Amino acid sequence: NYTFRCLQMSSFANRSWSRTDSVVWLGDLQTHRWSNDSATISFTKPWSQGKLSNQQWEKLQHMFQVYRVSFTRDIQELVKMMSPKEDYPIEIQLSAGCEMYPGNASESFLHVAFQGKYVVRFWGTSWQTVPGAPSWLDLPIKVLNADQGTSATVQMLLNDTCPLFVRGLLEAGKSDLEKQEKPVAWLSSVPSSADGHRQLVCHVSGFYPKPVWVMWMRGDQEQQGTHRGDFLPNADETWYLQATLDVEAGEEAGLACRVKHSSLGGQDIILYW
Amino acid sequence: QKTPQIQVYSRHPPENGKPNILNCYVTQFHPPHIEIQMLKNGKKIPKVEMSDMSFSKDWSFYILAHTEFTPTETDTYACRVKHASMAEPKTVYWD
Ligand SMILES: CCCCCCCC/C=C\CCCCCCCC(=O)OC[C@H](COP(=O)(O)O)OC(=O)CCCCCCC/C=C\CCCCCCCC
Ligand SMILES: *[C@@H]1O[C@H](CO)[C@@H](O[C@@H]2O[C@H](CO)[C@@H](O)[C@H](O)[C@H]2NC(C)=O)[C@H](O)[C@H]1NC(C)=O
Ligand SMILES: *[C@@H]1O[C@H](CO)[C@@H](O)[C@H](O)[C@H]1NC(C)=O
């Protein structure tokens, strides 16, 4: 069903410049942001505190404020030691959360990339380097693994806190997570990279949730030339997608673009070129 | 290092003389430090709003820029990006 991910982005440019910024997502909806500039974590939804009390939220945030400061210090100290072997600039990303499954099931994860590449995960009761990660990481990870209080805290957050927090968000954010917004579609054309050809573009915008169906059609016949692009975000938590069809001059006549979406309740949009 | 991809698209069907929103979606880049400008006839648009920086399953960064605009017949719009992976700023025009 839903993936919950806490994303940490830390940049170290020198001994005296670093920043750490986090965002939190529930599926494709942003629930939190934590800028380097701010002491406290910001809610980006009315329901971002889920079903936790003010006290439980405070504890949780307090723990993260201590963590953010300790993380930055420890990395700076690590660079001081590794150098010149590894040096600035340095980029570290953390992706931690859980994925919710059908009958109340839950899987947690915690992954770390260095310089844009996956290198470490927390797994079970300890951190580990993934196969092919550089060997100079073995010692710092052993050192980090000797800190048993940190290991216990992480286990508690992944095993217990994450799924508990998420059920609360799912319940509290219900009407937002289950919202239905309708696609609006339009047709245009752009030059083709092929001669004697023109590229037709069906734009579909403002829909939510993500799943959608868009095809160029000639009557009942699906046009297998239809090229769906990626899902692109609108700024208002709705989605945008286009589907293109390269056509020879004169095959243009009789083409339609058809759009299906759960919000339309069976009533497909059909535009004619 | 990863070179940014840039896609430019409107929020609503474009109608000349009618207020709309233009989006510039920048993806697939690394490191996260980046400069995004939206241009109207080659001049920087001053009020551009930025989503929070985020990243994908694959570790690469993405960020959405957007601005109010009201398209006419004669206006050109672009998104221009400066990033350490490119010697030259990359400009993508709205179609
Ligand atoms: C937003 C609400 C969501 C709540 C639900 C929670 C779901 C789980 C989400 C995140 C959990 C994972 C985040 C980790 C939390 C850390 C917990 C904690 O308290 O640790 C604090 C401790 C206490 O520090 P001290 O002062 O030394 O005692 O801090 C630390 O352990 C130090 C920080 C290290 C932890 C991360 C290390 C990353 C691992 C490898 C780094 C990569 C190496 C790059 C090498 C650098 C190049 C030279
Ligand atoms: C958090 O959950 C993991 C289970 O995924 C627990 O670690 C497992 O349990 C024991 C350690 O006593 C080992 O024999 C297993 O190998 C561990 N599993 C894996 C995949 O490594 C862990 O004990 C839990 N911690 C808490 C505090 O509940
Ligand atoms: C450290 O990095 C920042 C960010 O690039 C830069 O502005 C600053 O001048 C640098 N300082 C030193 C002493 O290298």
Ligand SMILES: *[C@@H]1O[C@H](CO)[C@@H](O)[C@H](O)[C@H]1NC(C)=O
């Ligand atoms: C990020 O936050 C820390 C701790 O408050 C601060 O000291 C540091 O200057 C900040 N980094 C930047 C680049 O502003």
